[PDB]
């Protein structure tokens, strides 16, 4: 995205677009609620037999 925006339009639209991407990424990452727990690490049930 950033490279095609630089090739078509130029420098100043690119430096505005980069800022807007940063702001909206931070906002929606905050609203998602992503976390890490102990149950997110799932061990396959057929390892004990491969061993």
């Amino acid at each position: 995205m950033l490279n095609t925006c630089y090739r078509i339009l130029g420098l100043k639209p690119t430096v505005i677009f980069a800022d807007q991407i940063m702001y909206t990424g931070f906002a929606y990452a905050a609203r998602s609620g992503a976390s890490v727990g102990i149950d997110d690490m799932v061990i396959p049930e057929k390892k004990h037999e491969i061993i």
Partner: protein
């Protein structure tokens, strides 16, 4: 993910947190989830011997 629809079940990509941040390119790789949830593997001596 086995999420069902208007009549019955089907499959889709997972919404697991670790998979989501590994697959998107934010932080991580497969080689490190392998050590988190798989087995660690073979270790070398300080000589270079395994």
């Amino acid at each position: 993910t086995v999420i069902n629809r208007d009549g019955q079940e089907e499959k889709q990509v997972s919404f697991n947190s670790i998979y989501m941040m590994a697959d998107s390119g934010a932080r991580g790789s497969a080689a490190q989830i392998r050590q988190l949830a798989g087995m660690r593997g073979l270790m070398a001596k300080p000589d270079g011997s395994i």
